[PDB]
Amino acid sequence: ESADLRALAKHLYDSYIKSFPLTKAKARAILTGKTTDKSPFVIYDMNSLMMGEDKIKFKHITPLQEQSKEVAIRIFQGCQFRSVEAVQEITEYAKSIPGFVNLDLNDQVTLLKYGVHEIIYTMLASLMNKDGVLISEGQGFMTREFLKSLRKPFGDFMEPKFEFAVKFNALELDDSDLAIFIAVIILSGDRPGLLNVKPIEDIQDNLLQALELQLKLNHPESSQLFAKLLQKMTDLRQIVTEHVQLLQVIKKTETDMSLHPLLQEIYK
Amino acid sequence: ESADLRALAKHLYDSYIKSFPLTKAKARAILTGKTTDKSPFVIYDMNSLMMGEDKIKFKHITPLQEQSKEVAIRIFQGCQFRSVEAVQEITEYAKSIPGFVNLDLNDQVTLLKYGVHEIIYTMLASLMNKDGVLISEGQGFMTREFLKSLRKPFGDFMEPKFEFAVKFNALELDDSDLAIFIAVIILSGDRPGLLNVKPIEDIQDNLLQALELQLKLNHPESSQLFAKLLQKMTDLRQIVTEHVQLLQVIKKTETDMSLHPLLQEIYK
Numbered sequence: 001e002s003a004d005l006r007a008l009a010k011h012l013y014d015s016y017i018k019s020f021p022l023t024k025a026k027a028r029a030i031l032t033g034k035t036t037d038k039s040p041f042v043i044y045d046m047n048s049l050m051m052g053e054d055k056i057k058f059k060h061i062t063p064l065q066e067q068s069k070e071v072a073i074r075i076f077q078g079c080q081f082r083s084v085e086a087v088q089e090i091t092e093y094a095k096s097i098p099g100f101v102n103l104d105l106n107d108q109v110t111l112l113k114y115g116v117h118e119i120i121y122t123m124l125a126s127l128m129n130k131d132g133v134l135i136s137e138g139q140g141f142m143t144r145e146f147l148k149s150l151r152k153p154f155g156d157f158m159e160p161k162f163e164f165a166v167k168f169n170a171l172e173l174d175d176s177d178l179a180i181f182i183a184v185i186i187l188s189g190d191r192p193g194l195l196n197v198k199p200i201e202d203i204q205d206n207l208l209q210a211l212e213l214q215l216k217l218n219h220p221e222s223s224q225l226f227a228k229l230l231q232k233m234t235d236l237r238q239i240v241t242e243h244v245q246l247l248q249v250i251k252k253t254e255t256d257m258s259l260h261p262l263l264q265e266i267y268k
Numbered sequence: 269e270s271a272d273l274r275a276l277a278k279h280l281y282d283s284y285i286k287s288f289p290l291t292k293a294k295a296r297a298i299l300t301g302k303t304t305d306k307s308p309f310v311i312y313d314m315n316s317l318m319m320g321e322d323k324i325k326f327k328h329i330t331p332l333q334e335q336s337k338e339v340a341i342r343i344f345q346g347c348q349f350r351s352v353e354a355v356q357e358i359t360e361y362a363k364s365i366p367g368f369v370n371l372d373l374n375d376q377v378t379l380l381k382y383g384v385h386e387i388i389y390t391m392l393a394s395l396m397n398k399d400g401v402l403i404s405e406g407q408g409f410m411t412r413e414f415l416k417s418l419r420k421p422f423g424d425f426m427e428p429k430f431e432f433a434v435k436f437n438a439l440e441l442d443d444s445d446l447a448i449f450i451a452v453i454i455l456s457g458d459r460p461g462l463l464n465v466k467p468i469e470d471i472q473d474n475l476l477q478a479l480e481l482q483l484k485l486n487h488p489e490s491s492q493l494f495a496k497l498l499q500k501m502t503d504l505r506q507i508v509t510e511h512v513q514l515l516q517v518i519k520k521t522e523t524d525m526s527l528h529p530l531l532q533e534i535y536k
Protein backbone atom coordinates (compact mmCIF):
# COMPACT_ATOMS: atom_id res chain seq x y z
CA GLU A 1 0.00 0.00 0.00
CA SER A 2 1.00 3.61 -0.54
CA ALA A 3 0.10 4.84 2.96
CA ASP A 4 2.62 2.31 4.30
CA LEU A 5 5.47 3.21 1.97
CA ARG A 6 4.81 6.73 3.18
CA ALA A 7 5.10 5.75 6.84
CA LEU A 8 8.34 3.81 6.47
CA ALA A 9 9.75 6.84 4.68
CA LYS A 10 8.96 9.21 7.57
CA HIS A 11 10.07 6.73 10.24
CA LEU A 12 13.38 6.22 8.40
CA TYR A 13 13.77 9.97 7.87
CA ASP A 14 13.31 10.60 11.56
CA SER A 15 15.90 8.05 12.68
CA TYR A 16 18.31 9.39 10.10
CA ILE A 17 17.96 13.03 11.20
CA LYS A 18 18.75 11.74 14.70
CA SER A 19 21.58 9.34 13.94
CA PHE A 20 23.28 12.02 11.86
CA PRO A 21 24.15 15.49 13.21
CA LEU A 22 25.19 17.35 10.01
CA THR A 23 22.41 16.76 7.46
CA LYS A 24 22.82 17.43 3.76
CA ALA A 25 20.51 20.45 4.19
CA LYS A 26 22.89 21.83 6.79
CA ALA A 27 26.03 20.93 4.78
CA ARG A 28 24.61 22.75 1.72
CA ALA A 29 23.55 25.80 3.74
CA ILE A 30 27.15 26.06 4.91
CA LEU A 31 28.55 25.22 1.46
CA THR A 32 27.97 27.08 -1.78
CA GLY A 33 24.58 28.07 -0.40
CA LYS A 34 24.69 31.36 1.46
CA THR A 35 23.26 30.66 4.92
CA THR A 36 26.37 32.34 6.31
CA ASP A 37 25.80 32.48 10.07
CA LYS A 38 29.27 31.11 10.85
CA SER A 39 31.53 30.50 7.82
CA PRO A 40 34.06 27.61 8.03
CA PHE A 41 37.86 27.69 8.17
CA VAL A 42 39.18 27.15 4.63
CA ILE A 43 42.23 25.00 4.07
CA TYR A 44 43.68 25.88 0.68
CA ASP A 45 47.42 25.99 1.36
CA MET A 46 50.01 23.80 3.01
CA ASN A 47 50.55 26.58 5.51
CA SER A 48 46.81 27.12 5.77
CA LEU A 49 46.55 23.54 7.04
CA MET A 50 49.00 24.17 9.88
CA MET A 51 47.29 27.40 10.72
CA GLY A 52 44.04 25.96 11.75
CA GLU A 53 44.85 22.68 12.85
CA ASP A 54 45.74 24.58 16.16
CA LYS A 55 42.32 25.96 16.71
CA ILE A 56 40.06 23.72 14.47
CA LYS A 57 38.27 21.16 16.81
CA PHE A 58 40.30 18.06 15.83
CA LYS A 59 41.42 15.18 18.08
CA HIS A 60 44.73 13.51 17.16
CA ILE A 61 47.86 15.53 16.27
CA THR A 62 48.73 19.24 16.30
CA PRO A 63 50.35 21.40 13.57
CA LEU A 64 53.90 19.96 13.62
CA GLN A 65 55.37 19.55 10.10
CA GLU A 66 59.16 19.44 9.86
CA GLN A 67 61.02 16.18 10.43
CA SER A 68 58.09 15.43 12.74
CA LYS A 69 55.74 13.09 10.85
CA GLU A 70 54.19 14.06 7.48
CA VAL A 71 51.03 15.79 6.31
CA ALA A 72 49.98 13.58 3.40
CA ILE A 73 49.48 10.88 6.03
CA ARG A 74 48.03 12.93 8.88
CA ILE A 75 45.22 13.87 6.47
CA PHE A 76 44.45 10.39 5.13
CA GLN A 77 44.48 8.89 8.64
CA GLY A 78 42.02 11.51 9.88
CA CYS A 79 39.51 10.40 7.25
CA GLN A 80 39.76 6.92 8.76
CA PHE A 81 39.17 8.13 12.33
CA ARG A 82 36.10 10.22 11.61
CA SER A 83 34.78 7.43 9.42
CA VAL A 84 35.06 5.03 12.35
CA GLU A 85 33.03 7.57 14.25
CA ALA A 86 30.55 7.71 11.43
CA VAL A 87 30.30 3.90 11.56
CA GLN A 88 28.77 3.96 15.01
CA GLU A 89 26.08 6.34 13.84
CA ILE A 90 25.35 4.09 10.81
CA THR A 91 25.11 0.99 12.99
CA GLU A 92 22.53 2.83 15.04
CA TYR A 93 20.51 3.92 12.02
CA ALA A 94 20.54 0.31 10.85
CA LYS A 95 18.85 -0.95 13.99
CA SER A 96 16.18 1.59 13.28
CA ILE A 97 15.25 -0.15 9.98
CA PRO A 98 12.14 -2.34 10.25
CA GLY A 99 13.15 -5.98 10.62
CA PHE A 100 16.87 -5.36 10.74
CA VAL A 101 17.30 -6.20 14.43
CA ASN A 102 15.09 -9.29 14.00
CA LEU A 103 17.69 -10.81 11.66
CA ASP A 104 20.26 -13.36 12.67
CA LEU A 105 23.12 -11.56 14.47
CA ASN A 106 25.73 -13.04 12.18
CA ASP A 107 23.90 -11.41 9.28
CA GLN A 108 23.43 -8.09 10.97
CA VAL A 109 27.21 -7.97 11.30
CA THR A 110 27.92 -9.12 7.73
CA LEU A 111 25.49 -6.56 6.32
CA LEU A 112 27.22 -3.87 8.30
CA LYS A 113 30.68 -5.18 7.55
CA TYR A 114 30.19 -4.81 3.78
CA GLY A 115 27.77 -1.93 3.55
CA VAL A 116 29.55 0.76 5.52
CA HIS A 117 32.07 1.91 2.85
CA GLU A 118 29.16 2.42 0.52
CA ILE A 119 27.20 4.32 3.20
CA ILE A 120 30.22 6.49 4.06
CA TYR A 121 31.02 7.54 0.48
CA THR A 122 27.37 8.28 -0.17
CA MET A 123 27.16 10.60 2.83
CA LEU A 124 30.56 12.17 2.18
CA ALA A 125 29.12 13.35 -1.12
CA SER A 126 26.73 15.46 0.94
CA LEU A 127 29.68 17.37 2.34
CA MET A 128 31.33 17.81 -1.07
CA ASN A 129 31.03 20.20 -3.99
CA LYS A 130 33.34 20.61 -7.02
CA ASP A 131 35.66 22.87 -5.04
CA GLY A 132 35.97 20.96 -1.80
CA VAL A 133 34.75 19.03 1.19
CA LEU A 134 33.54 20.24 4.58
CA ILE A 135 35.78 18.97 7.35
CA SER A 136 35.25 18.57 11.12
CA GLU A 137 31.49 18.67 11.62
CA GLY A 138 31.53 21.44 9.05
CA GLN A 139 33.81 23.73 11.05
CA GLY A 140 36.15 23.60 8.10
CA PHE A 141 36.55 23.20 4.37
CA MET A 142 39.46 21.46 2.66
CA THR A 143 39.81 22.65 -0.96
CA ARG A 144 39.85 20.22 -3.86
CA GLU A 145 42.98 22.12 -4.95
CA PHE A 146 44.97 21.27 -1.89
CA LEU A 147 43.78 17.65 -1.52
CA LYS A 148 44.30 16.91 -5.21
CA SER A 149 47.92 17.81 -4.45
CA LEU A 150 49.57 16.19 -1.45
CA ARG A 151 52.41 13.79 -2.13
CA LYS A 152 52.32 10.62 -4.24
CA PRO A 153 50.44 7.69 -2.60
CA PHE A 154 47.43 9.97 -1.86
CA GLY A 155 46.52 12.66 -4.39
CA ASP A 156 45.50 9.72 -6.55
CA PHE A 157 43.03 8.54 -3.95
CA MET A 158 40.97 11.68 -3.50
CA GLU A 159 40.27 13.21 -6.93
CA PRO A 160 38.27 10.27 -8.28
CA LYS A 161 35.97 10.63 -5.24
CA PHE A 162 35.25 14.22 -6.31
CA GLU A 163 34.29 12.91 -9.72
CA PHE A 164 31.69 10.66 -8.14
CA ALA A 165 30.32 13.36 -5.81
CA VAL A 166 29.59 15.79 -8.62
CA LYS A 167 27.73 13.14 -10.57
CA PHE A 168 25.87 11.73 -7.56
CA ASN A 169 25.06 15.23 -6.33
CA ALA A 170 23.79 16.20 -9.80
CA LEU A 171 20.89 14.01 -8.77
CA GLU A 172 19.88 16.66 -6.20
CA LEU A 173 18.65 14.21 -3.61
CA ASP A 174 17.80 15.37 -0.09
CA ASP A 175 17.97 13.72 3.34
CA SER A 176 14.43 12.36 2.90
CA ASP A 177 15.50 10.57 -0.30
CA LEU A 178 18.86 9.51 1.12
CA ALA A 179 17.56 8.04 4.34
CA ILE A 180 15.75 5.38 2.29
CA PHE A 181 18.56 4.96 -0.21
CA ILE A 182 20.97 4.25 2.66
CA ALA A 183 18.50 1.65 3.98
CA VAL A 184 18.37 -0.09 0.59
CA ILE A 185 22.20 -0.32 0.49
CA ILE A 186 22.28 -1.87 3.93
CA LEU A 187 19.61 -4.49 3.22
CA SER A 188 21.41 -5.97 0.22
CA GLY A 189 21.37 -9.75 -0.08
CA ASP A 190 24.50 -10.43 -2.09
CA ARG A 191 27.13 -9.75 0.58
CA PRO A 192 29.43 -12.75 0.97
CA GLY A 193 28.55 -15.01 3.88
CA LEU A 194 24.89 -14.16 4.55
CA LEU A 195 23.15 -17.13 6.10
CA ASN A 196 19.52 -16.21 5.42
CA VAL A 197 18.96 -14.07 2.34
CA LYS A 198 15.19 -14.46 2.19
CA PRO A 199 14.25 -11.97 5.00
CA ILE A 200 16.92 -9.50 3.95
CA GLU A 201 15.70 -9.22 0.35
CA ASP A 202 12.15 -9.25 1.64
CA ILE A 203 12.98 -6.07 3.59
CA GLN A 204 14.99 -4.43 0.78
CA ASP A 205 11.93 -5.02 -1.38
CA ASN A 206 9.80 -2.72 0.77
CA LEU A 207 12.58 -0.18 1.01
CA LEU A 208 12.94 -0.16 -2.81
CA GLN A 209 9.22 0.40 -2.95
CA ALA A 210 9.33 3.19 -0.40
CA LEU A 211 12.29 4.75 -2.24
CA GLU A 212 10.53 4.55 -5.58
CA LEU A 213 7.40 6.32 -4.27
CA GLN A 214 9.60 8.82 -2.44
CA LEU A 215 11.43 9.80 -5.60
CA LYS A 216 8.17 9.95 -7.49
CA LEU A 217 6.49 12.22 -5.00
CA ASN A 218 9.57 14.26 -4.15
CA HIS A 219 10.90 14.63 -7.73
CA PRO A 220 7.69 14.47 -9.88
CA GLU A 221 9.31 16.16 -12.82
CA SER A 222 12.32 13.87 -12.63
CA SER A 223 12.37 11.15 -15.28
CA GLN A 224 13.64 7.77 -14.11
CA LEU A 225 15.44 9.17 -11.04
CA PHE A 226 14.78 5.84 -9.33
CA ALA A 227 16.57 3.87 -12.10
CA LYS A 228 19.24 6.57 -12.32
CA LEU A 229 20.00 6.36 -8.59
CA LEU A 230 20.11 2.56 -8.61
CA GLN A 231 22.74 2.48 -11.32
CA LYS A 232 24.94 4.74 -9.27
CA MET A 233 25.52 1.75 -7.02
CA THR A 234 28.25 0.60 -9.38
CA ASP A 235 29.96 3.98 -9.00
CA LEU A 236 30.02 3.37 -5.25
CA ARG A 237 31.07 -0.26 -5.66
CA GLN A 238 34.01 0.83 -7.86
CA ILE A 239 34.94 3.65 -5.52
CA VAL A 240 34.97 1.18 -2.62
CA THR A 241 36.97 -1.42 -4.53
CA GLU A 242 39.41 1.29 -5.51
CA HIS A 243 39.52 2.42 -1.86
CA VAL A 244 40.82 -0.90 -0.52
CA GLN A 245 43.07 -1.14 -3.57
CA LEU A 246 44.87 1.92 -2.21
CA LEU A 247 44.12 1.06 1.41
CA GLN A 248 46.49 -1.86 0.92
CA VAL A 249 49.31 -0.02 -0.89
CA ILE A 250 49.45 2.32 2.11
CA LYS A 251 50.82 -0.80 3.81
CA LYS A 252 54.08 0.22 2.13
CA THR A 253 54.66 3.50 4.00
CA GLU A 254 54.12 4.19 7.73
CA THR A 255 54.37 0.60 8.95
CA ASP A 256 56.88 -1.09 11.29
CA MET A 257 56.78 0.99 14.48
CA SER A 258 55.98 -0.36 17.97
CA LEU A 259 53.95 2.73 18.95
CA HIS A 260 50.81 1.90 16.89
CA PRO A 261 49.71 -1.24 18.71
CA LEU A 262 46.40 -0.21 20.32
CA LEU A 263 45.92 2.42 17.63
CA GLN A 264 46.37 0.35 14.46
CA GLU A 265 43.98 -1.91 16.35
CA ILE A 266 41.17 0.58 16.81
CA TYR A 267 41.36 1.30 12.98
CA LYS A 268 41.76 -2.32 11.01
CA GLU B 269 2.70 7.48 -23.37
CA SER B 270 2.73 3.74 -22.70
CA ALA B 271 1.25 2.84 -26.10
CA ASP B 272 4.42 4.44 -27.48
CA LEU B 273 6.46 2.45 -24.93
CA ARG B 274 5.17 -0.91 -26.10
CA ALA B 275 6.07 0.18 -29.63
CA LEU B 276 9.68 0.86 -28.68
CA ALA B 277 9.82 -2.65 -27.14
CA LYS B 278 8.55 -4.37 -30.29
CA HIS B 279 11.10 -2.41 -32.25
CA LEU B 280 14.12 -3.27 -30.09
CA TYR B 281 12.97 -6.89 -29.98
CA ASP B 282 12.65 -7.24 -33.81
CA SER B 283 16.15 -5.84 -34.22
CA TYR B 284 17.33 -8.12 -31.45
CA ILE B 285 15.94 -11.13 -33.34
CA LYS B 286 17.46 -9.80 -36.56
CA SER B 287 20.90 -9.17 -35.04
CA PHE B 288 21.50 -12.27 -32.93
CA PRO B 289 21.36 -15.77 -34.50
CA LEU B 290 21.24 -17.48 -31.16
CA THR B 291 18.40 -16.21 -28.97
CA LYS B 292 17.93 -17.32 -25.34
CA ALA B 293 14.83 -19.25 -26.42
CA LYS B 294 16.73 -21.30 -28.99
CA ALA B 295 19.40 -21.76 -26.32
CA ARG B 296 17.11 -22.89 -23.50
CA ALA B 297 15.39 -25.29 -25.92
CA ILE B 298 18.76 -26.84 -26.74
CA LEU B 299 19.99 -26.86 -23.15
CA THR B 300 16.98 -28.57 -21.69
CA GLY B 301 17.87 -32.04 -22.93
CA LYS B 302 14.13 -32.03 -23.46
CA THR B 303 13.83 -30.74 -27.02
CA THR B 304 16.16 -33.06 -28.91
CA ASP B 305 15.25 -32.09 -32.46
CA LYS B 306 19.02 -31.51 -32.23
CA SER B 307 21.08 -31.88 -28.99
CA PRO B 308 24.76 -30.86 -28.43
CA PHE B 309 27.99 -32.86 -28.42
CA VAL B 310 29.40 -32.57 -24.89
CA ILE B 311 33.07 -31.57 -24.35
CA TYR B 312 34.08 -32.59 -20.80
CA ASP B 313 37.66 -33.81 -21.21
CA MET B 314 40.61 -34.07 -23.59
CA ASN B 315 39.07 -36.87 -25.62
CA SER B 316 35.70 -35.12 -25.74
CA LEU B 317 37.25 -31.93 -27.12
CA MET B 318 39.47 -34.05 -29.33
CA MET B 319 36.68 -36.12 -30.89
CA GLY B 320 34.69 -32.88 -30.98
CA GLU B 321 36.61 -31.39 -33.91
CA ASP B 322 34.94 -34.01 -36.10
CA LYS B 323 31.47 -33.56 -34.59
CA ILE B 324 31.21 -29.77 -35.00
CA LYS B 325 32.76 -27.00 -37.14
CA PHE B 326 36.11 -26.90 -35.29
CA LYS B 327 38.55 -25.46 -37.87
CA HIS B 328 40.98 -25.87 -34.95
CA ILE B 329 43.59 -28.55 -34.39
CA THR B 330 42.55 -31.98 -33.12
CA PRO B 331 45.82 -33.96 -32.67
CA LEU B 332 48.72 -32.90 -30.43
CA GLN B 333 48.56 -29.54 -28.70
CA GLU B 334 51.19 -29.40 -25.93
CA GLN B 335 53.89 -28.59 -28.53
CA SER B 336 51.78 -27.22 -31.43
CA LYS B 337 49.50 -24.53 -29.98
CA GLU B 338 48.14 -26.38 -26.94
CA VAL B 339 44.44 -26.88 -26.21
CA ALA B 340 44.21 -24.10 -23.63
CA ILE B 341 45.35 -21.82 -26.47
CA ARG B 342 42.97 -23.07 -29.18
CA ILE B 343 40.01 -22.79 -26.80
CA PHE B 344 40.75 -19.13 -26.13
CA GLN B 345 41.69 -18.21 -29.66
CA GLY B 346 38.20 -19.34 -30.66
CA CYS B 347 36.64 -17.47 -27.77
CA GLN B 348 38.40 -14.44 -29.29
CA PHE B 349 36.75 -14.97 -32.66
CA ARG B 350 33.33 -15.38 -31.06
CA SER B 351 34.02 -12.05 -29.38
CA VAL B 352 34.66 -10.34 -32.71
CA GLU B 353 31.38 -11.77 -34.03
CA ALA B 354 29.43 -10.52 -31.02
CA VAL B 355 30.87 -7.02 -31.41
CA GLN B 356 29.95 -7.09 -35.09
CA GLU B 357 26.44 -8.30 -34.20
CA ILE B 358 26.03 -5.93 -31.24
CA THR B 359 27.26 -3.04 -33.39
CA GLU B 360 24.53 -3.91 -35.88
CA TYR B 361 21.93 -3.87 -33.08
CA ALA B 362 23.13 -0.47 -31.76
CA LYS B 363 22.45 1.23 -35.09
CA SER B 364 18.83 0.14 -34.61
CA ILE B 365 18.40 1.92 -31.23
CA PRO B 366 16.50 5.17 -31.79
CA GLY B 367 18.77 8.20 -31.60
CA PHE B 368 22.00 6.20 -31.50
CA VAL B 369 23.16 6.91 -35.05
CA ASN B 370 22.32 10.60 -34.65
CA LEU B 371 24.70 11.02 -31.67
CA ASP B 372 28.15 12.58 -32.16
CA LEU B 373 30.16 10.21 -34.32
CA ASN B 374 32.88 10.07 -31.68
CA ASP B 375 30.61 8.95 -28.85
CA GLN B 376 29.01 6.22 -30.97
CA VAL B 377 32.44 4.59 -30.93
CA THR B 378 32.83 5.19 -27.19
CA LEU B 379 29.47 3.71 -26.11
CA LEU B 380 30.53 0.68 -28.13
CA LYS B 381 34.11 0.58 -26.83
CA TYR B 382 32.87 0.20 -23.25
CA GLY B 383 29.47 -1.38 -23.70
CA VAL B 384 30.48 -4.22 -26.03
CA HIS B 385 31.62 -6.55 -23.24
CA GLU B 386 28.96 -5.98 -20.59
CA ILE B 387 26.42 -7.01 -23.20
CA ILE B 388 28.50 -9.97 -24.31
CA TYR B 389 28.58 -11.52 -20.84
CA THR B 390 24.92 -10.69 -20.38
CA MET B 391 23.96 -12.69 -23.48
CA LEU B 392 26.58 -15.36 -22.79
CA ALA B 393 24.41 -16.19 -19.78
CA SER B 394 21.59 -17.26 -22.11
CA LEU B 395 24.02 -20.01 -23.22
CA MET B 396 24.94 -21.30 -19.77
CA ASN B 397 23.66 -23.46 -16.94
CA LYS B 398 25.54 -24.18 -13.72
CA ASP B 399 27.27 -26.96 -15.71
CA GLY B 400 28.58 -25.40 -18.88
CA VAL B 401 28.24 -23.29 -21.96
CA LEU B 402 26.93 -23.66 -25.52
CA ILE B 403 29.54 -23.20 -28.28
CA SER B 404 29.57 -23.12 -32.11
CA GLU B 405 25.97 -21.99 -32.52
CA GLY B 406 24.76 -24.39 -29.83
CA GLN B 407 26.16 -27.40 -31.67
CA GLY B 408 28.42 -28.09 -28.71
CA PHE B 409 28.43 -27.77 -24.92
CA MET B 410 31.67 -27.29 -22.98
CA THR B 411 31.83 -28.26 -19.30
CA ARG B 412 32.33 -25.65 -16.56
CA GLU B 413 34.66 -28.30 -15.13
CA PHE B 414 36.78 -28.98 -18.23
CA LEU B 415 37.34 -25.24 -18.74
CA LYS B 416 38.40 -24.51 -15.16
CA SER B 417 40.82 -27.45 -15.31
CA LEU B 418 43.05 -25.83 -17.93
CA ARG B 419 46.48 -24.22 -17.36
CA LYS B 420 47.15 -21.92 -14.36
CA PRO B 421 45.87 -18.73 -16.08
CA PHE B 422 43.26 -19.63 -18.69
CA GLY B 423 41.69 -22.06 -16.22
CA ASP B 424 40.13 -19.13 -14.36
CA PHE B 425 39.02 -16.97 -17.27
CA MET B 426 35.55 -18.54 -17.39
CA GLU B 427 34.75 -19.43 -13.78
CA PRO B 428 33.74 -15.79 -13.05
CA LYS B 429 31.30 -15.71 -15.99
CA PHE B 430 29.62 -18.94 -14.85
CA GLU B 431 29.27 -17.38 -11.40
CA PHE B 432 27.39 -14.37 -12.78
CA ALA B 433 25.34 -16.46 -15.21
CA VAL B 434 23.82 -18.71 -12.56
CA LYS B 435 22.56 -15.74 -10.53
CA PHE B 436 21.66 -13.62 -13.55
CA ASN B 437 19.67 -16.48 -15.10
CA ALA B 438 17.85 -16.58 -11.78
CA LEU B 439 15.93 -13.49 -12.92
CA GLU B 440 14.25 -15.61 -15.60
CA LEU B 441 14.44 -12.79 -18.09
CA ASP B 442 13.63 -13.56 -21.71
CA ASP B 443 14.67 -12.37 -25.14
CA SER B 444 12.12 -9.55 -25.28
CA ASP B 445 13.41 -8.28 -21.89
CA LEU B 446 17.11 -8.59 -22.69
CA ALA B 447 16.43 -6.62 -25.85
CA ILE B 448 15.44 -3.49 -23.88
CA PHE B 449 18.07 -4.06 -21.17
CA ILE B 450 20.86 -4.50 -23.73
CA ALA B 451 19.92 -1.12 -25.20
CA VAL B 452 20.18 0.54 -21.74
CA ILE B 453 23.69 -0.90 -21.25
CA ILE B 454 24.72 0.94 -24.42
CA LEU B 455 22.97 4.30 -23.94
CA SER B 456 24.65 4.90 -20.55
CA GLY B 457 26.33 8.28 -20.29
CA ASP B 458 28.38 7.83 -17.11
CA ARG B 459 30.81 6.46 -19.70
CA PRO B 460 34.38 7.82 -19.53
CA GLY B 461 35.17 10.46 -22.15
CA LEU B 462 31.86 11.20 -23.87
CA LEU B 463 31.68 14.63 -25.55
CA ASN B 464 27.92 15.11 -25.36
CA VAL B 465 26.02 13.39 -22.57
CA LYS B 466 22.53 14.75 -22.11
CA PRO B 467 21.54 13.66 -25.64
CA ILE B 468 22.32 10.17 -24.34
CA GLU B 469 20.53 10.39 -21.00
CA ASP B 470 17.35 11.41 -22.83
CA ILE B 471 17.56 8.26 -24.91
CA GLN B 472 18.36 5.97 -21.98
CA ASP B 473 15.70 7.73 -19.92
CA ASN B 474 13.20 6.51 -22.50
CA LEU B 475 14.54 2.97 -22.82
CA LEU B 476 14.33 2.76 -19.01
CA GLN B 477 10.65 3.55 -19.26
CA ALA B 478 10.37 0.88 -21.95
CA LEU B 479 12.10 -1.72 -19.71
CA GLU B 480 10.12 -0.70 -16.63
CA LEU B 481 6.77 -1.26 -18.32
CA GLN B 482 8.09 -4.38 -20.06
CA LEU B 483 8.98 -6.00 -16.74
CA LYS B 484 5.70 -5.16 -15.00
CA LEU B 485 3.80 -6.55 -17.99
CA ASN B 486 6.03 -9.51 -18.77
CA HIS B 487 6.60 -10.49 -15.12
CA PRO B 488 3.57 -9.46 -12.99
CA GLU B 489 4.05 -11.99 -10.20
CA SER B 490 7.39 -10.35 -9.46
CA SER B 491 8.60 -7.42 -7.37
CA GLN B 492 11.44 -5.05 -8.19
CA LEU B 493 12.74 -7.10 -11.11
CA PHE B 494 13.43 -3.70 -12.58
CA ALA B 495 15.55 -2.77 -9.52
CA LYS B 496 17.13 -6.21 -9.15
CA LEU B 497 17.98 -6.08 -12.86
CA LEU B 498 19.66 -2.65 -12.73
CA GLN B 499 21.65 -3.70 -9.66
CA LYS B 500 22.91 -6.60 -11.80
CA MET B 501 24.70 -3.98 -13.89
CA THR B 502 27.53 -3.66 -11.35
CA ASP B 503 28.01 -7.43 -11.51
CA LEU B 504 28.99 -6.95 -15.15
CA ARG B 505 31.26 -3.99 -14.36
CA GLN B 506 33.31 -6.11 -11.94
CA ILE B 507 33.58 -8.96 -14.47
CA VAL B 508 35.04 -6.49 -16.96
CA THR B 509 37.82 -5.42 -14.61
CA GLU B 510 38.96 -8.96 -13.82
CA HIS B 511 38.75 -9.93 -17.48
CA VAL B 512 40.97 -7.14 -18.81
CA GLN B 513 43.63 -7.54 -16.14
CA LEU B 514 43.60 -11.30 -16.68
CA LEU B 515 43.90 -10.50 -20.39
CA GLN B 516 46.93 -8.33 -19.65
CA VAL B 517 48.70 -11.39 -18.23
CA ILE B 518 48.41 -13.63 -21.30
CA LYS B 519 49.65 -10.69 -23.36
CA LYS B 520 53.10 -10.97 -21.76
CA THR B 521 53.68 -14.66 -21.07
CA GLU B 522 52.41 -15.12 -24.62
CA THR B 523 54.44 -12.71 -26.77
CA ASP B 524 53.45 -14.50 -29.98
CA MET B 525 49.89 -14.24 -28.67
CA SER B 526 47.99 -11.44 -30.37
CA LEU B 527 44.54 -9.81 -30.01
CA HIS B 528 42.10 -8.86 -32.82
CA PRO B 529 42.55 -5.09 -33.67
CA LEU B 530 38.81 -4.50 -33.32
CA LEU B 531 39.01 -5.98 -29.82
CA GLN B 532 42.43 -4.52 -29.10
CA GLU B 533 41.19 -1.05 -29.95
CA ILE B 534 38.25 -1.71 -27.61
CA TYR B 535 40.50 -2.56 -24.65
CA LYS B 536 41.66 0.13 -22.22
Ligand SMILES: CC(C)c1ccccc1-c1ccc(O[C@@H](Cc2ccccc2)C(=O)O)cc1
Nearest residue numbers: 344345347348350351354388515518525526531
Ligand atom coordinates in the same frame (compact mmCIF):
# COMPACT_ATOMS: atom_id res chain seq x y z
C1 LIG C 1 41.73 -15.90 -23.43
C2 LIG C 1 42.70 -14.77 -23.79
C3 LIG C 1 44.05 -14.96 -23.09
C4 LIG C 1 42.91 -14.74 -25.31
C5 LIG C 1 44.05 -15.33 -25.83
C6 LIG C 1 44.30 -15.32 -27.20
C7 LIG C 1 43.38 -14.70 -28.05
C8 LIG C 1 42.24 -14.11 -27.53
C9 LIG C 1 41.99 -14.12 -26.16
C10 LIG C 1 40.79 -13.58 -25.71
C11 LIG C 1 40.58 -13.27 -24.37
C12 LIG C 1 39.34 -12.82 -23.93
C13 LIG C 1 38.30 -12.65 -24.84
O1 LIG C 1 37.10 -12.18 -24.41
C14 LIG C 1 36.48 -11.33 -25.38
C15 LIG C 1 35.04 -10.99 -24.96
C16 LIG C 1 34.14 -12.21 -25.10
C17 LIG C 1 34.35 -13.34 -24.30
C18 LIG C 1 33.57 -14.47 -24.50
C19 LIG C 1 32.57 -14.49 -25.47
C20 LIG C 1 32.36 -13.36 -26.26
C21 LIG C 1 33.14 -12.23 -26.07
C22 LIG C 1 37.26 -10.03 -25.57
O2 LIG C 1 38.26 -9.83 -24.86
O3 LIG C 1 36.85 -9.23 -26.45
C23 LIG C 1 38.51 -12.95 -26.18
C24 LIG C 1 39.75 -13.40 -26.61
Ligand SMILES: CC(C)c1ccccc1-c1ccc(O[C@@H](Cc2ccccc2)C(=O)O)cc1
Nearest residue numbers: 326343346347350392402403404405425426429
Ligand atom coordinates in the same frame (compact mmCIF):
# COMPACT_ATOMS: atom_id res chain seq x y z
C1 LIG D 1 32.65 -17.27 -22.13
C2 LIG D 1 33.70 -16.17 -22.30
C3 LIG D 1 33.52 -15.09 -21.23
C4 LIG D 1 35.12 -16.75 -22.22
C5 LIG D 1 35.98 -16.24 -21.26
C6 LIG D 1 37.27 -16.73 -21.11
C7 LIG D 1 37.70 -17.76 -21.95
C8 LIG D 1 36.85 -18.27 -22.91
C9 LIG D 1 35.56 -17.77 -23.06
C10 LIG D 1 34.79 -18.26 -24.11
C11 LIG D 1 33.93 -17.43 -24.83
C12 LIG D 1 33.25 -17.90 -25.94
C13 LIG D 1 33.43 -19.22 -26.36
O1 LIG D 1 32.69 -19.66 -27.42
C14 LIG D 1 33.41 -20.40 -28.41
C15 LIG D 1 33.77 -21.79 -27.89
C16 LIG D 1 34.56 -22.63 -28.91
C17 LIG D 1 35.83 -23.09 -28.58
C18 LIG D 1 36.52 -23.92 -29.46
C19 LIG D 1 35.94 -24.28 -30.67
C20 LIG D 1 34.67 -23.82 -31.00
C21 LIG D 1 33.98 -23.00 -30.12
C22 LIG D 1 32.45 -20.52 -29.60
O2 LIG D 1 31.22 -20.51 -29.36
O3 LIG D 1 32.94 -20.61 -30.75
C23 LIG D 1 34.28 -20.06 -25.65
C24 LIG D 1 34.95 -19.58 -24.53
